[PDB]
Tab-separated table of C-alpha atoms in Angstrom:
chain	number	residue	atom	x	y	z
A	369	UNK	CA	2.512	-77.431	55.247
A	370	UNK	CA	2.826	-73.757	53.255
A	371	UNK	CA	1.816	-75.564	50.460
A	372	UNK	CA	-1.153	-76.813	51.675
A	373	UNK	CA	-2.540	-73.430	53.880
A	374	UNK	CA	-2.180	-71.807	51.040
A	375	UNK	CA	-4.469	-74.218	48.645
A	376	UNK	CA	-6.938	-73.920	51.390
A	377	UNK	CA	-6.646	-70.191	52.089
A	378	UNK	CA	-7.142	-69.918	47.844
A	379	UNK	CA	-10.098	-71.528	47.933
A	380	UNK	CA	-12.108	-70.433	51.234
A	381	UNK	CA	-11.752	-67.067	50.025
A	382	UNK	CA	-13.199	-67.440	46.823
A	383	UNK	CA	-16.686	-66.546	48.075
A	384	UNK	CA	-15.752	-63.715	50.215
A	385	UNK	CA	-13.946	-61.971	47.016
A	386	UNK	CA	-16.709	-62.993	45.317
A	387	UNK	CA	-19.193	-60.488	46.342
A	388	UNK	CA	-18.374	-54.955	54.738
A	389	UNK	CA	-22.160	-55.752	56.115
A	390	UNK	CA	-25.402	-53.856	55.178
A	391	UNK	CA	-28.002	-52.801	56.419
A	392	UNK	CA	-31.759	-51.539	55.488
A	393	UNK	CA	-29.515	-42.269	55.147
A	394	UNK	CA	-26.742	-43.306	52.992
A	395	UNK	CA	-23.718	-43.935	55.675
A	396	UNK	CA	-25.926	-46.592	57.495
A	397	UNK	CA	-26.291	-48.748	54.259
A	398	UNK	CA	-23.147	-50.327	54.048
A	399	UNK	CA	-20.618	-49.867	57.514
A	400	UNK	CA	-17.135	-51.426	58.098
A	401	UNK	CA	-16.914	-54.420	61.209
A	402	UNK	CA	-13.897	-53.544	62.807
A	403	UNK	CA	-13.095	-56.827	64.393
A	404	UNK	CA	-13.417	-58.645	60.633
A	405	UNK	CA	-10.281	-56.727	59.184
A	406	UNK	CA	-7.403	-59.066	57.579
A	407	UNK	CA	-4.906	-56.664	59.191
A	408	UNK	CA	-3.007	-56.727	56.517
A	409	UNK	CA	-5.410	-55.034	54.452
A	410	UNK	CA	-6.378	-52.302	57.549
A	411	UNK	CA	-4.443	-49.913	55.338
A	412	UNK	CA	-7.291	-49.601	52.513
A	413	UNK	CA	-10.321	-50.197	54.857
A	414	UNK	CA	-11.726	-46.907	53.642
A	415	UNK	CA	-11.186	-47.657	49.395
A	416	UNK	CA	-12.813	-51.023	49.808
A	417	UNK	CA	-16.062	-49.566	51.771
A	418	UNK	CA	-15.857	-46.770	49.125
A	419	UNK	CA	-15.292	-48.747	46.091
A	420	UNK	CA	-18.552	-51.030	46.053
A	421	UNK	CA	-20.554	-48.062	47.577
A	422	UNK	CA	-20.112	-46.170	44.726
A	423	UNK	CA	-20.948	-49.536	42.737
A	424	UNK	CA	-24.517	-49.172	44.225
A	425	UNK	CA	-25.835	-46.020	44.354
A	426	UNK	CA	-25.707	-46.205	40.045
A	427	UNK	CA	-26.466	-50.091	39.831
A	428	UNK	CA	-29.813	-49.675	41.228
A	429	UNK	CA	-30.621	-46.408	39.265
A	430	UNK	CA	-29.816	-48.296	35.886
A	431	UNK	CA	-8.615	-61.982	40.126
A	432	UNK	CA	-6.545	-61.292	43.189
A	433	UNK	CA	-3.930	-63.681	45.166
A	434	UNK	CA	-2.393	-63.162	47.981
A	435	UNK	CA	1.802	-63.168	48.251
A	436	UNK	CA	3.911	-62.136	51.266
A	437	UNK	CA	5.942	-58.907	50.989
A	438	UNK	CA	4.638	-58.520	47.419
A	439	UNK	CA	1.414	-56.135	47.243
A	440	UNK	CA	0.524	-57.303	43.938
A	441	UNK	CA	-2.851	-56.823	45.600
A	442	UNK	CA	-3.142	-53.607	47.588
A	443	UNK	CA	-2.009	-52.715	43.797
A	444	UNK	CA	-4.885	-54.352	42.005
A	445	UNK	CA	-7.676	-52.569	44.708
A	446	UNK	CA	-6.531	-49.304	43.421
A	447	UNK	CA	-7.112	-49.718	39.770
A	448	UNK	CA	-10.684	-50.652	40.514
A	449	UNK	CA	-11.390	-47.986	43.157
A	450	UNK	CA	-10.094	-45.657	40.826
A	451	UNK	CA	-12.493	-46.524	38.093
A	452	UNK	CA	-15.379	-46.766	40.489
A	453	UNK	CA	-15.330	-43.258	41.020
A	454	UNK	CA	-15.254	-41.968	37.124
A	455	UNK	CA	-18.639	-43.919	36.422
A	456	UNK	CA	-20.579	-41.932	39.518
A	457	UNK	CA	-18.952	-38.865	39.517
A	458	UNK	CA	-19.333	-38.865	35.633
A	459	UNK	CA	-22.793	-39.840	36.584
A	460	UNK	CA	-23.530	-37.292	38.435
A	461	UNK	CA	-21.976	-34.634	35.664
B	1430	UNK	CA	26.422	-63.749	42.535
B	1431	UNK	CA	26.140	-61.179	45.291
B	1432	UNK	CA	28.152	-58.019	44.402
B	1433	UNK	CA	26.453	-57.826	40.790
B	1434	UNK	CA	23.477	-57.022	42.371
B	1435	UNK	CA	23.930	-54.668	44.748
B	1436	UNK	CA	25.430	-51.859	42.615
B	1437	UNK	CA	22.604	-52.666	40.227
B	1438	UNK	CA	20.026	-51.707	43.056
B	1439	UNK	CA	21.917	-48.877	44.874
B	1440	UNK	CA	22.366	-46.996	41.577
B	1441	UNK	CA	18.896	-47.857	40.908
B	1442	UNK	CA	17.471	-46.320	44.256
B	1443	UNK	CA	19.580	-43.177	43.571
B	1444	UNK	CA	17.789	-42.525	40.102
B	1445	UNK	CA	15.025	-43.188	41.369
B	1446	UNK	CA	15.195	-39.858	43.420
B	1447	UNK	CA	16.249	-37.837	40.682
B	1448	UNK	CA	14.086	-38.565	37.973
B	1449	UNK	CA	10.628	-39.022	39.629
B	1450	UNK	CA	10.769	-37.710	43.085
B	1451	UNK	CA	13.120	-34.277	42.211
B	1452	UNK	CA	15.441	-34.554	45.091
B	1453	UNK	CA	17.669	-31.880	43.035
B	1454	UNK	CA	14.611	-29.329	42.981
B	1455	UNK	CA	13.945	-29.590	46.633
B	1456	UNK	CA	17.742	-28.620	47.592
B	1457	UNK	CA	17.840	-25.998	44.718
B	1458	UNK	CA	14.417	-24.766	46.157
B	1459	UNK	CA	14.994	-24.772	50.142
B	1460	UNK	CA	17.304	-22.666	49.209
B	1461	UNK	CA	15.701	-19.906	47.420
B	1462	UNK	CA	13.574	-19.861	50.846
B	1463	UNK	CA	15.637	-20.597	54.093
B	1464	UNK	CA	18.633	-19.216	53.214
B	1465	UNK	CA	17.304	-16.052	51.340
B	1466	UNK	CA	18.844	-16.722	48.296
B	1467	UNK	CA	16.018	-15.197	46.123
B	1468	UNK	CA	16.087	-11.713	46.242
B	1469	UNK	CA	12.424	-9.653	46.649
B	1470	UNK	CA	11.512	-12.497	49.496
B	1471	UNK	CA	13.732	-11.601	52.136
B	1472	UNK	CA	13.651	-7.829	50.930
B	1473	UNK	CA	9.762	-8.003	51.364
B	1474	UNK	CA	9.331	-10.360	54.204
B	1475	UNK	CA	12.172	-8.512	56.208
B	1476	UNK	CA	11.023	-5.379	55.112
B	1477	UNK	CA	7.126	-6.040	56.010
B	1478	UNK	CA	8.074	-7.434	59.686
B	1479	UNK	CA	10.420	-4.530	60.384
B	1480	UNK	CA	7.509	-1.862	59.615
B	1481	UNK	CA	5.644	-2.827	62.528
B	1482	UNK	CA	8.544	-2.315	65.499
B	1483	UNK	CA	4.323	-7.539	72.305
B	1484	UNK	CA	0.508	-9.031	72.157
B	1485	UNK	CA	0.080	-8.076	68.822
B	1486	UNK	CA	2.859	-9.070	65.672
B	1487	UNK	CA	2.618	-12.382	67.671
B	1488	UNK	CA	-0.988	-13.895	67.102
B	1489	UNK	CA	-1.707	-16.569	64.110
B	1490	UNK	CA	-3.686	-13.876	62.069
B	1491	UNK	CA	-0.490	-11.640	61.212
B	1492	UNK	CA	2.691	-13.561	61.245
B	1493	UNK	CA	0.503	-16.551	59.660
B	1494	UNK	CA	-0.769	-14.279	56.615
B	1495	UNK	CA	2.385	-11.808	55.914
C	366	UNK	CA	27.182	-85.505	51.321
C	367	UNK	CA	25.296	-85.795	54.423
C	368	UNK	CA	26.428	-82.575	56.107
C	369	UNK	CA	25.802	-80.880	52.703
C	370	UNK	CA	22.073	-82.137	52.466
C	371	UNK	CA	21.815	-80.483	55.616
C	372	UNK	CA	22.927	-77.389	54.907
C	373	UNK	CA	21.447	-77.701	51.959
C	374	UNK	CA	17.987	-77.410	53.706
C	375	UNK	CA	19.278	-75.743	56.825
C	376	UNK	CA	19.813	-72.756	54.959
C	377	UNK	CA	16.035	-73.053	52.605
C	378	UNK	CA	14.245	-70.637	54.823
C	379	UNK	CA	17.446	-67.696	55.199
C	380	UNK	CA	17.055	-67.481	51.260
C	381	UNK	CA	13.658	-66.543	51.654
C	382	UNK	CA	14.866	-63.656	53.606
C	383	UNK	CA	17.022	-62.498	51.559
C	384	UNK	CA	14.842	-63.215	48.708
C	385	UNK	CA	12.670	-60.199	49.907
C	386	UNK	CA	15.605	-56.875	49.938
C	387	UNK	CA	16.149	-58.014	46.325
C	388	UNK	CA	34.212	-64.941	60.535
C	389	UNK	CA	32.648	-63.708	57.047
C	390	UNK	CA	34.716	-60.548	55.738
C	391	UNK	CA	32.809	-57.753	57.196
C	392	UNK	CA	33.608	-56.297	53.670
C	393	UNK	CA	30.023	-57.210	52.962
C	394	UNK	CA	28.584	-57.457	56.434
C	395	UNK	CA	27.479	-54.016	56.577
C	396	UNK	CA	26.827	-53.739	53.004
C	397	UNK	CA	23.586	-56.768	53.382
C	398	UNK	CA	22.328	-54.703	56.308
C	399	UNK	CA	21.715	-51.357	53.738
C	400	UNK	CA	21.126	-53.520	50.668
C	401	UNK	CA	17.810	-54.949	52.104
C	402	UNK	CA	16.634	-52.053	53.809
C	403	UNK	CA	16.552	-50.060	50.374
C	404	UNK	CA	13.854	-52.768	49.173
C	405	UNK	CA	11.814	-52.900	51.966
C	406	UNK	CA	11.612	-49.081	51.671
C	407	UNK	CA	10.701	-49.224	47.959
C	408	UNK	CA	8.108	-52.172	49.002
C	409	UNK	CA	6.239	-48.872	50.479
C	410	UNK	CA	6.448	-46.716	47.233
Protein backbone atom coordinates (compact mmCIF):
# COMPACT_ATOMS: atom_id res chain seq x y z
CA UNK A 1 0.00 0.00 0.00
CA UNK A 2 3.39 2.40 -0.58
CA UNK A 3 3.20 1.29 -3.87
CA UNK A 4 0.00 2.32 -4.60
CA UNK A 5 -0.06 6.07 -2.56
CA UNK A 6 2.62 6.75 -4.35
CA UNK A 7 1.08 6.02 -8.08
CA UNK A 8 -1.73 8.13 -6.89
CA UNK A 9 0.25 10.91 -5.21
CA UNK A 10 2.36 10.91 -8.94
CA UNK A 11 -0.45 11.52 -10.70
CA UNK A 12 -2.80 14.02 -8.62
CA UNK A 13 0.02 16.25 -8.60
CA UNK A 14 0.61 16.47 -12.08
CA UNK A 15 -1.68 19.49 -12.48
CA UNK A 16 -0.60 21.36 -9.51
CA UNK A 17 3.23 21.19 -10.88
CA UNK A 18 1.84 21.91 -13.89
CA UNK A 19 1.22 25.52 -13.59
CA UNK A 20 0.48 30.31 -4.75
CA UNK A 21 -3.05 32.23 -5.62
CA UNK A 22 -3.44 35.60 -7.48
CA UNK A 23 -5.09 38.19 -7.43
CA UNK A 24 -6.17 41.39 -9.69
CA UNK A 25 0.78 47.11 -6.53
CA UNK A 26 3.03 44.31 -7.26
CA UNK A 27 3.10 42.27 -3.72
CA UNK A 28 -0.77 41.82 -3.94
CA UNK A 29 -0.53 39.98 -7.38
CA UNK A 30 0.60 36.78 -6.44
CA UNK A 31 0.58 35.98 -2.20
CA UNK A 32 1.51 32.68 -0.43
CA UNK A 33 -1.75 30.61 1.52
CA UNK A 34 -0.23 29.60 4.53
CA UNK A 35 -2.49 26.76 5.41
CA UNK A 36 -1.75 25.10 1.64
CA UNK A 37 2.07 24.45 2.43
CA UNK A 38 3.34 20.65 1.87
CA UNK A 39 5.41 21.15 5.04
CA UNK A 40 7.97 19.59 3.70
CA UNK A 41 8.57 22.14 1.24
CA UNK A 42 7.92 25.23 4.07
CA UNK A 43 11.67 25.60 3.76
CA UNK A 44 11.60 27.27 0.10
CA UNK A 45 8.14 28.98 0.45
CA UNK A 46 9.84 32.25 -0.40
CA UNK A 47 11.99 30.81 -3.89
CA UNK A 48 8.81 29.28 -5.19
CA UNK A 49 6.61 32.67 -4.74
CA UNK A 50 9.77 34.38 -6.14
CA UNK A 51 10.58 32.12 -8.92
CA UNK A 52 7.27 32.39 -11.11
CA UNK A 53 6.95 36.12 -10.04
CA UNK A 54 9.84 36.95 -11.73
CA UNK A 55 8.43 34.63 -14.66
CA UNK A 56 5.65 37.32 -15.04
CA UNK A 57 6.60 40.59 -14.76
CA UNK A 58 8.86 39.84 -18.36
CA UNK A 59 6.25 37.28 -19.90
CA UNK A 60 3.69 39.86 -20.23
CA UNK A 61 6.13 42.65 -21.43
CA UNK A 62 7.33 40.27 -24.36
CA UNK A 63 10.17 17.01 -14.09
CA UNK A 64 10.22 16.63 -10.34
CA UNK A 65 9.39 13.40 -8.04
CA UNK A 66 9.14 13.18 -4.81
CA UNK A 67 11.58 10.60 -2.56
CA UNK A 68 11.87 10.45 1.25
CA UNK A 69 15.15 11.65 2.82
CA UNK A 70 16.47 12.32 -0.70
CA UNK A 71 15.96 16.15 -1.79
CA UNK A 72 16.49 15.39 -5.29
CA UNK A 73 13.81 18.07 -5.40
CA UNK A 74 14.45 20.98 -3.05
CA UNK A 75 17.68 20.50 -5.46
CA UNK A 76 15.91 20.81 -8.76
CA UNK A 77 13.79 24.26 -7.39
CA UNK A 78 17.07 25.91 -7.08
CA UNK A 79 18.42 25.50 -10.52
CA UNK A 80 15.28 27.10 -11.86
CA UNK A 81 14.99 29.92 -9.30
CA UNK A 82 18.38 30.62 -10.04
CA UNK A 83 17.85 31.11 -13.71
CA UNK A 84 14.66 33.02 -13.15
CA UNK A 85 16.45 35.76 -11.79
CA UNK A 86 19.32 36.23 -14.68
CA UNK A 87 16.47 36.75 -17.40
CA UNK A 88 14.79 39.88 -15.24
CA UNK A 89 17.57 41.23 -13.67
CA UNK A 90 19.40 40.99 -17.11
CA UNK A 91 16.20 42.51 -18.23
CA UNK A 92 16.24 45.17 -16.38
CA UNK A 93 20.22 45.91 -17.27
CA UNK B 1 29.44 -5.90 4.37
CA UNK B 2 29.29 -3.40 7.20
CA UNK B 3 32.84 -2.32 8.23
CA UNK B 4 33.83 -1.56 4.43
CA UNK B 5 31.62 1.11 4.53
CA UNK B 6 32.01 2.94 7.34
CA UNK B 7 35.70 3.91 7.00
CA UNK B 8 34.76 4.76 3.43
CA UNK B 9 32.23 7.45 4.80
CA UNK B 10 34.07 8.68 7.96
CA UNK B 11 37.19 9.45 5.89
CA UNK B 12 34.91 10.87 3.44
CA UNK B 13 33.15 13.35 5.95
CA UNK B 14 36.64 14.38 7.20
CA UNK B 15 37.76 15.57 3.59
CA UNK B 16 35.00 16.94 3.15
CA UNK B 17 35.95 19.66 5.81
CA UNK B 18 39.23 20.23 4.54
CA UNK B 19 38.91 20.68 1.04
CA UNK B 20 35.64 22.69 0.64
CA UNK B 21 34.65 24.04 3.94
CA UNK B 22 38.56 25.11 5.22
CA UNK B 23 38.30 23.81 8.68
CA UNK B 24 42.32 24.23 8.72
CA UNK B 25 41.95 28.10 7.85
CA UNK B 26 39.44 28.76 10.52
CA UNK B 27 41.84 27.26 13.40
CA UNK B 28 44.95 28.87 11.71
CA UNK B 29 42.79 32.14 11.58
CA UNK B 30 41.03 32.26 15.20
CA UNK B 31 44.17 32.33 16.07
CA UNK B 32 45.74 35.24 14.50
CA UNK B 33 42.63 37.02 16.36
CA UNK B 34 41.75 35.57 19.89
CA UNK B 35 44.87 34.66 20.95
CA UNK B 36 46.88 37.70 19.54
CA UNK B 37 49.06 35.85 17.56
CA UNK B 38 49.36 38.52 14.77
CA UNK B 39 51.37 41.19 15.80
CA UNK B 40 50.09 45.11 14.90
CA UNK B 41 46.36 43.83 16.12
CA UNK B 42 46.85 43.46 19.63
CA UNK B 43 49.63 46.28 19.54
CA UNK B 44 46.91 48.62 17.99
CA UNK B 45 43.76 47.42 19.56
CA UNK B 46 45.52 47.32 23.08
CA UNK B 47 47.22 50.32 22.41
CA UNK B 48 43.96 52.35 21.11
CA UNK B 49 41.78 51.14 24.30
CA UNK B 50 44.54 52.00 26.75
CA UNK B 51 44.71 55.78 25.39
CA UNK B 52 41.45 56.56 26.68
CA UNK B 53 41.95 55.51 30.70
CA UNK B 54 32.70 54.94 33.04
CA UNK B 55 29.56 56.15 30.69
CA UNK B 56 31.62 56.75 27.93
CA UNK B 57 34.43 53.86 26.38
CA UNK B 58 31.29 51.70 27.09
CA UNK B 59 28.49 52.71 24.49
CA UNK B 60 28.09 50.72 20.95
CA UNK B 61 29.52 53.78 18.98
CA UNK B 62 33.24 53.41 20.37
CA UNK B 63 34.07 49.95 21.44
CA UNK B 64 31.82 48.81 18.29
CA UNK B 65 33.98 50.98 15.71
CA UNK B 66 37.73 50.84 17.27
CA UNK C 1 12.58 -22.09 6.53
CA UNK C 2 9.61 -20.76 8.15
CA UNK C 3 11.28 -18.77 10.93
CA UNK C 4 13.69 -17.49 8.21
CA UNK C 5 10.79 -16.17 5.89
CA UNK C 6 9.92 -14.34 8.83
CA UNK C 7 12.78 -12.73 9.56
CA UNK C 8 13.25 -12.41 6.30
CA UNK C 9 10.36 -9.82 6.17
CA UNK C 10 10.47 -8.95 9.83
CA UNK C 11 13.53 -7.21 9.29
CA UNK C 12 12.28 -5.37 5.42
CA UNK C 13 11.40 -2.12 7.04
CA UNK C 14 14.88 -1.80 9.65
CA UNK C 15 16.86 -1.87 6.21
CA UNK C 16 15.11 1.02 5.14
CA UNK C 17 16.49 2.74 8.10
CA UNK C 18 19.58 2.04 7.72
CA UNK C 19 19.34 2.49 4.10
CA UNK C 20 19.12 6.32 4.82
CA UNK C 21 22.84 7.06 7.11
CA UNK C 22 24.43 5.40 4.06
CA UNK C 23 23.98 -9.46 22.90
CA UNK C 24 25.58 -7.96 19.54
CA UNK C 25 29.39 -6.97 20.25
CA UNK C 26 29.07 -3.45 21.27
CA UNK C 27 32.28 -3.25 19.07
CA UNK C 28 29.92 -1.81 16.51
CA UNK C 29 27.04 -0.68 18.67
CA UNK C 30 28.29 2.69 19.13
CA UNK C 31 29.95 2.87 15.90
CA UNK C 32 25.99 2.59 13.88
CA UNK C 33 24.86 5.33 16.25
CA UNK C 34 27.79 7.98 14.66
CA UNK C 35 27.80 6.30 11.25
CA UNK C 36 24.17 7.44 10.49
CA UNK C 37 24.22 10.62 12.09
CA UNK C 38 27.16 11.79 9.68
CA UNK C 39 24.56 11.23 6.68
CA UNK C 40 21.74 12.74 8.00
CA UNK C 41 23.99 15.78 8.64
CA UNK C 42 25.32 15.78 5.05
CA UNK C 43 21.46 15.25 3.92
CA UNK C 44 21.44 19.15 5.10
CA UNK C 45 24.55 20.28 3.03
Amino acid sequence: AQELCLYLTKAASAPYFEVVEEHEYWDQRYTIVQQQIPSFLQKMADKILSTGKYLNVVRECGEIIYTLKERAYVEQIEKAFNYASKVLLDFLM
Amino acid sequence: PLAAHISLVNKAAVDYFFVELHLEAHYEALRHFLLMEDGEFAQSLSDLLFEKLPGELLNPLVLNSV
Amino acid sequence: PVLLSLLKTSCEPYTRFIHDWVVFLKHIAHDIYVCGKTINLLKLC
